[PDB]
């Protein structure tokens, strides 16, 4: 890996080779890329189309579909998808026109996926595409991103660089686990394992490798039951034993410690509800020797060889993982980078280090900030229904990876920008996309607290969370917030030997307190950005480790980075920090707003988000998180009331399901369209010509006159001789058609046939040959035989029916003479 570097450079500035050369030094191998003042939404559109196209290809190469679903070949699907993509090269217009073309192209893929993979629910087709794109992106790696803006703040600085360096998120344990997965040839989770209750899942996933057969499992569990009802005689008060276990804090009862790994983890789960503990035990004894045994006896002892995080993956994820792993010698190259949406593997997503550099005309670089580290929240929203143990392997492993550049003696912040909301308070609104479900923020909050607690021994970490959300009431950081106090208390210790710190502590105290007094109008959004920026500036001037996230790490976090960058640029230009308490009329606020707006409009952060899902280059909900005067300045600079809503539209496009937040063809129409295309011109023409002759011998289709079945003459076969399907196929053949045209005619004729009933004992030989053979192209055959071979047989059969009929009419015209 080490995939490369893109330096974005404003359109039409020329660069002295002294700068190009300083760039080579700091960013060896870099590629230049041009940007403009005005967002290019046509670019984001092509990127998204292209990425999803590649995601279809990943899907089809990685995930097997049963051959019984459809008679269509991979080659026919890929050609169809290629044509759908080529139809979007013309798309021109407003962001609205292009969003519609995107919605159309995406729906085409989803529908093709539901068809070829036989998805009962269209949403599974959505998830297949969405997740295939993520794994395609992991495999490909990520370019580091540098954005160059001309600005002068000092003699030294003529250019400002925003920098985000992608960071490998793997760690040794995971690499070892990935190696095992390949060596075992990518076993998939069997259904029986998925169906287990949490304690039983712990049993099998932690089973000691001394237990080598299903017979040894039964005995192991019975030996546990004896040893258990033994401990229930001898333990002094069971519950204070069990509540130390749920708590998990020593001193643990002695018997528990000496339980084998798997008995241990099974207890850990059962101890959380002692009332049903003994019931569940005798229910597992019963499970083991029950009907499951037929199915699990050869596989149950193989589970614990691979990690529990692997086994909870859906089956499609496992094939996706497999397909990326299969393409590298070094397993680390399969996992060099994870998209923000990709929270099913226990390593950090969207993990990067953000820094700010000044560059002078003669090519001297100066560091304007240290590295500030960013990632998706350490806890996974994707695993809230998984066992507690997997949920913690994610948070622990991610917390460790994200502290990797800290030192265990130096200060370290975990700054989260999320908004926990209980179910009793949650109103679906514009900030959360009208999600009908509870946002994960509250679960994520607690999961991160727990993780930092477990790491207390190794490293002490400052935790600050900044909510900013609307439901029944506004939610924001309180003046009296506890974690702010610990931060002030901890940071004051440093004031007397840290130059610059005191004025930041005064400011932070002041902004925190500014909430208590009331004007009628108050900039709560700005207060938040100032609170979050000052915390970072405090850590930075102290020299501690700067880390933070929002839920995805591309949105609120991007805003903090811009805001904090802007404060650093402001200090650098005018000699002091800008401050919260400033009237908007004033020259100081205007100058800060200019810097913020400049940084935001460079679109550096937007691009960084885009790399998570290309074509998704925007920021979530800017008009909620930005103060009014910054938002207004951006809006007016771009001359559009819409400009921040377009940013939010482009962000929302990262999830395939949300492409339909701002199409399917009828019952069998797609299958028929593609069956005709797979037949191709030559075959459709043979089928067409043979059918043309046969169908125009209209007598062959008239059934017998079946008196015993009819009561009203009006609905008799006498009055309605030709079956309607056949009448329709005449209707379709009434215009003359040649060549390419024949493919559409066959498409359409097959639409008719696909609606016909399967069995109807009153049909004539010819009606059954027309319907039956044509329908045979819409199913897969028993012994796999080519379309061309079925064409052969069908033409022969229809040609014979035509000839016999022709001869019998001419031998009843000899009856005449």
List, as one string, the DSSP characters of 102-133.
Answer: HHHHHHHHHHHHHHHHT-SSHHHHHHHHHHHH
Q: Rounded to an integer, what distance in angstroms lies between the CA atom of residue 723 and that of residue 700?
A: 11
As given in the structure block, the two tokens for residue 692 are 């043309």
- Closest by Cα among 576, 109, 1 to 329: 1
Q: What are phi and psi of 126, to 5 degrees?
A: -65, -50
Q: How are beta strands 372-374 and 352-359 bridged, if at all?
A: antiparallel
- E strands, 471-581, are 474-476, 545-549
Is there a contact between 700 and 805 (Cβ–Cβ < 8 Å)? yes
317 three-class SS: helix
Task: Report how this structure was experimentally obtained.
Answer: X-ray
CA dihedral 485, 491, 495, 501 (to 10 degrees): -100
E-strand ranges in 471-620 read: 474-476, 545-549
Q: What are phi and psi of 426, to 5 degrees?
A: -75, 115
Query: DSSP assignment of 542-557, as one string?
Result: HT-EEEEE-SSSSSHH
DSSP assignment string, 33-60: EEE-SS--HHHHHHHHHHHHHHHHHHHH
What is d(CA 544, CA 454) in angstroms, rounded to the nearest whole number?
A: 21
Residue linked to tokens 């196929």: 729
352 in Cβ contact with 373 (< 8 Å): yes
Tokens of 740: 């390419």
Topology of domain 190-305, CATH: Peroxidase; domain 1 (1.10.520)
| Nearest residue to 53 via CA among 125, 118, 106, 124 | 106
**Virtual torsion, Cα 44, 50, 52, 56, nearest 10 deg:** 180
- Nearest by Cα to 606 from 40, 49, 18: 40
Burial of 780 (C-beta count, 10 Å sphere; 0-12/13-18/19+): middle
User: CA angle at residue 447 from 444 to 453, to 5 degrees?
Assistant: 140
List CB contacts of 499: < 8 A, sequence separation 6 or more: 541
Tell me the C-alpha distance between 399 and 448, whole Å. 8
What is the maximum alpha-carbon separation in the chain? 126
Residue 113: CA count within 13 A, CB half-sphere:
27
Question: Which parts of 468-550 are beta strand (E)?
Answer: 468-470, 474-476, 545-549
Name residues whose C-beta falls within 8 Å of residue 210's C-beta, 6 or more positions apart in sequence. Answer: none
What DSSP character marks residue 625?
H
CB 163 within 8 A of CB 357: yes
Q: How many CB atoms lie within 10 A of CB 273?
A: 11
3-state secondary structure of 699: helix
Q: What angle do CA 261, 185, 51 make, to 5 degrees?
A: 110
Q: How far apart are CA 460 and CA 476, in angstroms?
A: 25
Closest C-alpha to 553, from 616, 615, 619, 474: 619
| Assigned CATH topology for domain 665-817 | 1.20.120
Long-range interactions of 640-648: CB distance < 8 A, separation 24+: 643/39, 646/39, 646/41, 646/95, 646/618, 647/39, 647/606, 647/618, 647/619, 647/622, 648/618, 648/619, 648/620, 648/621, 648/622, 648/623
Task: Give Cα separations from 613 to 47, 617, 681, 807 (angstroms).
Answer: 9, 8, 38, 66
The full set of domain ranges for the chain reads 2-189+306-664, 190-305, 665-817
Token pair in block for residue 445:
């909050």
Rounded-to-5 percentages of helix, strand, coil across the chain: 55, 5, 35
In whole angstroms, give the CA distance from residue 611 to residue 594: 27
How far is residue 658's CA from residue 618's CA, in Å, rounded to a whole number? 14
Dist. CA 683–CA 789, nearest whole Å: 10
End-to-end Cα distance, the chain: 89
The answer to whether residues 56 and 79 touch, using CB atoms and an 8 Å cutoff, is no
């Amino acid at each position: 890996m080490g995939k490369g570097i893109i330096v974005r450079v404003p359109h039409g500035i020329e660069l002295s080779s002294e700068l190009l050369s300083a760039l080579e030094v700091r960013f060896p191998g870099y590629i230049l890329e041009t940007y403009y003042q005005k967002p290019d939404y046509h670019r984001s559109f092509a990127r998204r189309v292209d990425s999803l196209h590649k995601a279809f290809y990943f899907l089809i190469d990685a995930y097997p579909f049963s051959a019984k679903n459809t008679p269509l070949t991979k080659q026919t699907l890929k050609a169809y998808v290629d044509e759908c993509k080529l139809a979007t090269t013309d798309a021109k217009g407003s962001i609205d026109d292009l969003h519609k073309e995107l919605e159309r192209f995406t729906a085409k893929l989803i529908e093709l996926i539901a068809l070829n993979w036989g998805c009962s629910e269209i949403k599974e087709a959505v998830e297949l595409l969405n997740e295939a794109e993520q794994y395609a992106l992991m495999g490909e790696g990520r370019y580091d991103l540098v954005t160059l803006l001309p600005m002068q703040l000092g003699q030294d600085v003529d250019y400002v660089l925003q920098v985000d360096e992608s960071l490998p998120p793997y760690y040794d344990q995971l690499l070892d686990e990935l190696t095992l997965i390949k060596a075992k040839k990518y076993p998939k989770t069997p259904g029986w394992l998925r169906d287990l209750e949490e304690y039983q899942h712990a049993y099998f996933c932690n089973l000691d490798q001394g237990v080598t057969s299903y017979l040894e499992v039964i005995r192991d569990f019975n030996n546990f039951l004896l040893n258990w009802a033994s401990i229930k005689k001898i333990a002094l008060s069971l519950n204070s034993d069990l509540q130390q276990i749920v708590s998990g804090s020593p001193p643990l009862p002695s018997w528990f410690n000496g339980l084998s790994v798997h008995q241990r983890e099974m207890m850990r789960i059962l101890a959380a509800d002692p009332t049903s503990l003994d019931k569940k035990l005798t229910q597992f004894k019963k499970f083991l020797t029950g009907d499951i045994k037929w199915e699990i006896w050869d596989t149950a002892t193989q589970i614990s060889s691979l990690p529990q995080w692997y086994w909870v993956l859906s089956e499609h994820q496992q094939f996706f993982l497999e397909h990326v792993l299969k393409g590298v010698d070094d397993v680390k190259d399969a996992v060099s980078f994870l998209s923000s949406r990709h929270r099913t593997l226990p390593l950090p997503a969207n993990y990067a280090a953000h820094s700010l550099l000044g560059l002078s005309e003669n090519g001297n670089m100066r560091e304007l900030s240290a590295k500030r580290y960013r990632s998706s929240h350490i806890a996974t929203r994707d695993g809230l229904n998984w066992p507690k143990a997997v949920q913690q392997r994610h948070s622990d492993s991610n917390l460790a990876k994200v502290m990797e550049y800290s030192k265990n003696d130096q200060l370290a912040i975990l700054q989260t920008l999320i908004s926990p909301i209980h179910a009793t308070e949650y109103v679906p609104n514009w900030i959360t996309d009208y999600l009908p479900t509870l946002p994960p923020d509250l679960d994520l909050y607690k999961l991160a607290r727990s993780a930092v607690e477990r790491r207390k021994e190794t490293q002490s970490i400052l935790q600050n969370n900044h909510p900013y959300n609307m439901a029944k009431r506004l939610y924001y950081t309180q003046a009296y917030d506890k974690d702010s106090q610990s931060l002030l208390v901890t940071a004051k210790k440093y004031a007397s030997f840290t130059p610059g710190l005191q004025e930041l502590l005064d400011q932070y105290q002041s902004v925190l307190e500014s909430a208590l007094g009331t004007a009628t109008i108050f900039d709560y959004a700005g207060r938040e950005l100032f609170l979050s920026s000052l915390e970072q500036l405090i850590i930075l001037t102290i020299g501690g480790h700067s880390y933070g996230s929002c839920v995805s790490g591309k949105d609120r976090k991007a805003i903090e980075l811009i805001h904090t960058d802007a404060m650093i640029l402001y200090k650098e230009c005018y000699g002091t920090w800008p401050v919260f308490d400033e009237l908007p009329d004033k020259e100081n606020r205007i100058r800060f707003v200019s810097l913020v707006a400049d940084l935001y409009m460079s679109r550096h952060q937007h691009e960084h988000a885009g790399q998570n899902a290309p074509g998704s280059e925007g920021i979530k909900t800017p008009e909620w998180y930005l103060p009014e005067d910054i938002a207004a300045e951006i809006r007016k600079r771009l001359d559009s009331e819409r400009s921040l809503k377009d940013d939010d539209r482009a962000a929302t496009d990262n999830e395939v399901k949300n492409i339909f937040i701002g199409y399917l063809l009828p019952e069998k129409k797609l299958l028929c369209r593609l069956v005709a295309r797979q037949l191709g011109e030559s075959n459709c023409t043979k089928l067409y010509d043979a059918l043309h002759s046969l169908i125009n011998e209209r007598n062959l289709f008239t059934p017998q006159e079946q008196s015993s079945r009819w009561t009203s003459s009006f609905f008799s076969s006498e009055s309605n001789p030709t079956p309607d399907g056949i009448k329709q196929i005449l209707e379709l053949m009434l215009s003359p058609s040649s060549g390419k045209d024949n493919i559409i005619r066959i498409e359409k004729i097959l639409q008719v046939v696909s609606e016909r009933p399967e069995i109807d004992g009153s049909r004539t030989e010819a009606t059954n040959s027309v319907y039956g053979r044509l329908r045979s192209f819409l199913n897969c055959s028993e012994k796999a035989t080519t379309f061309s071979e079925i064409v052969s047989t069908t033409v022969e059969e229809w040609t014979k029916l035509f000839e016999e009929s022709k001869r019998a009419h001419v031998k009843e015209f000899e009856s005449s003479h």
